[PDB]
Amino acid sequence: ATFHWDDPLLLDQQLADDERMVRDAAHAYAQGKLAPRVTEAFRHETTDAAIFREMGEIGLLGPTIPEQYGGPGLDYVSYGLIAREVERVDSGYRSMMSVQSSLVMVPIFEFGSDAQKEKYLPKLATGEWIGCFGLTEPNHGGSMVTRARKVPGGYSLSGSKMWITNSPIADVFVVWAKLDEDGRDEIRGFILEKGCKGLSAPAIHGKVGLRASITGEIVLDEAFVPEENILPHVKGLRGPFTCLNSARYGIAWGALGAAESCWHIARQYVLDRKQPLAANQLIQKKLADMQTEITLGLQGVLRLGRMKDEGTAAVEITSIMKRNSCGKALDIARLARDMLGFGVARHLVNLEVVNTYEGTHDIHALILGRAQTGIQA
Amino acid sequence: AATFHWDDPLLLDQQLADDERMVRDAAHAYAQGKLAPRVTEAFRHETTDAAIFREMGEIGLLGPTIPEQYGGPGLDYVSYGLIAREVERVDSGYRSMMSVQSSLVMVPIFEFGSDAQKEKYLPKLATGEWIGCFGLTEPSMVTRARKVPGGYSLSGSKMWITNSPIADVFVVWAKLDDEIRGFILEKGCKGLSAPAIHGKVGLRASITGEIVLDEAFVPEENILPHVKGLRGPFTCLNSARYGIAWGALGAAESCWHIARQYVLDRKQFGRPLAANQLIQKKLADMQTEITLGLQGVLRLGRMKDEGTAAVEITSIMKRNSCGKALDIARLARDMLGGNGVARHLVNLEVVNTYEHDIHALILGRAQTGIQA
Amino acid sequence: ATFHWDDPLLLDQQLADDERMVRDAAHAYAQGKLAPRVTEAFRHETTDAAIFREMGEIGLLGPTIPEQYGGPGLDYVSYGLIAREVERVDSGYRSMMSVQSSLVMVPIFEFGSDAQKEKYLPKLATGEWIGCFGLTEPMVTRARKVPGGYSLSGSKMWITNSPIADVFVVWAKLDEDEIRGFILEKGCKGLSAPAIHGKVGLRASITGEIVLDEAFVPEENILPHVKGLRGPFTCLNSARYGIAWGALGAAESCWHIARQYVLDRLAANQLIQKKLADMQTEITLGLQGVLRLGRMKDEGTAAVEITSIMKRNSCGKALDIARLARDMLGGVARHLVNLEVVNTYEGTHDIHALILGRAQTGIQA
Amino acid sequence: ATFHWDDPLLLDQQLADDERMVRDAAHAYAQGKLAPRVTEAFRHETTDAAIFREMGEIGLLGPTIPEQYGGPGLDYVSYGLIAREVERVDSGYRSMMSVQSSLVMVPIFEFGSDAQKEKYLPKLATGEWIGCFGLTEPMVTRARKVPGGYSLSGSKMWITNSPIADVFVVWAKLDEDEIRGFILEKGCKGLSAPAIHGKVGLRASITGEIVLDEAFVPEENILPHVKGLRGPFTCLNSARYGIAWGALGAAESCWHIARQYVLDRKQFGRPLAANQLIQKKLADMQTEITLGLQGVLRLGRMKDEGTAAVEITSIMKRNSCGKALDIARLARDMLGGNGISDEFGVARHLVNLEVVNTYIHALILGRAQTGIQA
Ligand SMILES: COC(=O)c1cccs1
């Protein structure tokens, strides 16, 4: 038996040929089309919507969505493998894809009416329509202030969502808002379309990380939403969480792609650098640590993927892998950065935003601590 | 929605074959039933109890991978892993005693020995009737064999040998003419002395000593015929390191469990300690590392059973398990206020320091071609 | 232009001639009398009160206490140099000392009466009387006015020196509820001090409890010039200052042991070198901090929050260095279990981070 | 009696009255003139040559250079305090200063002829002439003897100031019976200095190449009093001392920004400052800066009194930069959002410090402890 330094536990052999082909298709697309764009896309914060069509056309948008609705009807491991190949190039591109698949197609497929599913899903699956997802607000992460008023014909929406990836270029908007409906105040999901009166999506520029992805606001001022546009089959925490859980899973796989790019570059760098550097034992220890955390992270997300597919995965498990992948990836980017004398620095600032996106209070540690102790911090 | 198991998030239990689950439960019932009530006083007073070898041999826990042909239970590598984890869950010293019999003594005889050696030594080693030790370390190896009528004559010293003062069987590595060879010696071989060493800081539950050799006659039927060079010792060490990778995770789990129960019990400014945000971070870290470390040694086990595992993978897992376990023992120790965990901690400081950072450098060479 | 690996910033050169001999005095004592004792003392948790006699003999007890009361009349830099030389051998030893100096002789000197100071200090200085400090409980311990005198009742826990102490400085509450200081003496009825055995760290020091079952305390035994929080706190702040110097001595043993180890077989290893450099750096920087704190304490320019910086840093870094040294080996182990206790003695909630966080922000955690 | 959270060991009071004045002048300048420039200068990688004359006119260039040659004749502590007030704004600005001081003025003063020192130093001191330091390559750069002097052929990479420099201190190998230092001037035939743009860190400083193609150097342009390693090393040792102070200015900025952030920000009803972990991090930042400052101070004094070995600058540079980078990362990870607010001045300090920490010392201390090279 021979050693594969780049795949010590032979993940490649733990996958079905099925999943390998999906991985290889995602790799071919990301390396062929995204890598030639990424440097100046990031450097100059370009808007590049053409990516939704490209991924849609080869069946990599909404991977778990059934063929009935235009999806490629794949499993969670394949979704994972796709995220990882996209983020290997850049987290901003993976972000764009996460939104479409997990934050837009999922809640529509899961909670929407037949009419909503057939109207929206097929066009989201091809990338003809671009989605975004409105949950997070100007600042307090349930405690949401965006509000729907029952009016003749449907609903009137007022509030503001902030840091919404895809929002300046989106055709479809999934927005979460409190509806006080006699005499109970619950969170409901609403579909809005581009050009809806009272709906704005201003762009945010001068971002520090995720510069390759166009991000903006969702500003709602008495924006009318017809009855047929409320998500009928969900209320409360279940709506937003189903989406977030799907997205966190993809990010857990994706951040390991980013970690792997940093690791490969660091390794190649020390192989090429005469001073060679590879003979240094502090350098060797760093490479051993990178290889280790990635190899173990990959076994975790693979096992989680398999459990999700078999229906045995509790939601708390996602907190372990997302938190671990993002944290370990950031550690690896910092370690690789500190070893260099372009790509790494990009992944590094991307990962700094990703690690802090869901707050600076370590939400996943708290989900896990509560799961262990019973007690909320 | 599916149920979360905080103590087994990836449902390791469900990834085990039923065979493997039963081996685990058998080791668990033994270690919790026989070793746990002994451990506190044994560690405090460095009391030897070799009764463990006979006890473990009875339930077929020694030489787990050795075929039934030779008295062994004929289990797979995953089962070996599970046993070490259940034993180290109590104490690393008890696990060391077992690592030695299984990986350092029965493995070399089975892998490199003659039919005669295997039929003679393995069955009593498997039942724990004979106790084995592994003579490699020395106080670029000094110990030498020399050819004489009927056999060989050995002279030299081995130091820090676990099991040696109580061993019946000795697997000794000496240079012959210039290659390292393995020799099987018995207690009551003229020329062999095995004095004890006392007052260790860690692994106090096990007994360790020397092997002093002086014209010790080893008959012809007693040289290991099927190995020469670094392959002999390294094969044993590779086997032992695999069991230690699982074992350090059992010790890590105990520390995690103790720390979790501790913060559930103790109170701080009105709330239980478990309510603190910092405490939960630590519990989350302990849970994460244990859960991921387990998936690693399980995959390594599966690969060894299918013959797809290279030797470098063992380095990843042993270094990771021992390093993470040590981090968790320290985290747990630092979470306690006053003056089990302290014992696990000093044990894991010896385990981690034993072989420096040879594994990071093995992994470094495997990535880069260059040896440092 | 000549480099000292063991003293990169030449602390020696920053010390007064007076201070430099006191350090070498505590060093000659610690290495001469304490080093040959420590291994077996720690091993069996043996009691040896001879150390109080010996340190007293040579003026290392209550070192800031004025010559008028039996003290050597030294300053804070000198006090720290002593703690550091003593802890360099063992933390348990330093603990016994810093109880005498900071937790017994300081509160008596600072808050005592003329008669109390004349009676207790001179004998505490020579080590003839051994003191202990009674603050920590399993605060509930109350003073009840009599007759006398006062009638104290309660229990103190983890009291170093107590099973062999002659003098007990006990802090209890009294209403007119304010915390007051009390002096008690061995033989006192209702007072008892049973030992505590089977410790993990600090085995070389003796520790016990203070059980007060309506112990009678004459009015000539209460501390007049102290009430409330600033009592215990003045003592603790004094001890914390000494521990900040001490932890660094223990850190230095571990570094020196570790450096010697890699020389005797390893020193070419770049991982090792990084580790030895980290030890060198943190100790070197730690010393500049405690020295500067000392100079400031002697000039009156030192605020109390500064003791939180240096104590937290010394202890935390010493523990890191002891663990770094241990993981390099194949004395350190004893310093390690000691430092593990020392880092958590004041709790596990990082009291000094919270003190400093508040000083920076004006907001309590 | 009173705690000073921003200066717990009152470093202020450990300074001579002379050193304090110099610090206040560096502060007033950097805050007055550099703070308003930085955000846009860093964003667009803007070139402002004018800063050298500004720094020159207040005697911030070549602080240790004697008054005889236009220097302000200050001590090492003062040089340190200057670098710290400048890097408090931005490492890119400090990088310009330390190149002029330690990498251009120092080799000429230390190793140059008397005619070189009086030709070059007074103009370098006023900022009339801008200098650069040609050591790093993509050593191969070669000086060869020709009638009248030397011909230089070679190529230097990542040379800060090079595209705007009037004076080039170029280290090249010359064969005599070894590394030699040469002085070149702007406009020399066979000398070009193309700029590098698109940098990740240190964007506020201009950096470029030195390309030498048979560049003729007069005989009186070779540095007469240095051969081999000690030349480039002495400059770098000087620069390293300045970097050790500057890095702590940067760290102090990230610390201050993080502290104000948690003051202005609320989370779950309470201000962020009330969070235990936040307080720990702020205690760590305060601790490492305070101790870092005591270290660089003591090093300066030793350098002034002439008792510091080269090894001590290694420990101080490594520590300052390594701790400054930890503090920047600690501050960064405390901030929510993505670039728009003031607090993301921390992101700027961070990419700067990632380059500074990269621009060996642990192996110096290891070998100095042990006598064994690794
Ligand atoms: C893709 O952007 C998001 O909404 C995220 C959700 C969780 C991490 S990032």
Residue numbers in the entry:
A (entry chain C): 4 to 144, 148 to 281, 285 to 350, 358 to 393
B (entry chain D): 3 to 141, 149 to 186, 191 to 352, 359 to 374, 377 to 393
C (entry chain B): 4 to 141, 150 to 187, 191 to 279, 286 to 350, 359 to 393
D (entry chain A): 4 to 141, 150 to 188, 192 to 373, 379 to 393
From the paper:
Additional structures of BpGCDH resulting from this effort were obtained by soaking apo BpGCDH crystals in drops containing our Fragments of Life (FOL) ligand collection prior to data collection. All fragments identified by screening which bind BpGCDH occupy the pockets that bind the glutaryl and flavin moieties of the substrate and cofactor, respectively. The crystallographic water coordinated to the Arg97 side chain in the apo structure of BpGCDH remains in place when FOL544 is bound, but is displaced by FOL239 and FOL6421. This new position appears to facilitate ligand binding by providing a parallel aromatic surface that aligns with the heteroaromatic rings of all three fragments. This perturbation results in a new orientation of the catalytic YEG motif. Thus, the binding of small metabolite-like ligands induces a conformation in apo crystals of BpGCDH that partially fills the FAD-binding site with protein residues.
Glutaryl-CoA dehydrogenase (GCDH) is an acyl-CoA dehydro­genase (ACDH) which catalyzes an intermediate step in the metabolic breakdown of lysine and tryptophan. Transfer of electrons from the glutaryl-CoA precursor to the electron-transfer flavoprotein is mediated by the cofactor flavin adenine dinucleotide (FAD) in both prokaryotic and eukaryotic electron-transport chains. Like other ACDHs, GCDH from B. pseudomallei (BpGCDH) exists as a homotetramer with tetrahedral symmetry and possesses an overall fold similar to that of the human enzyme.
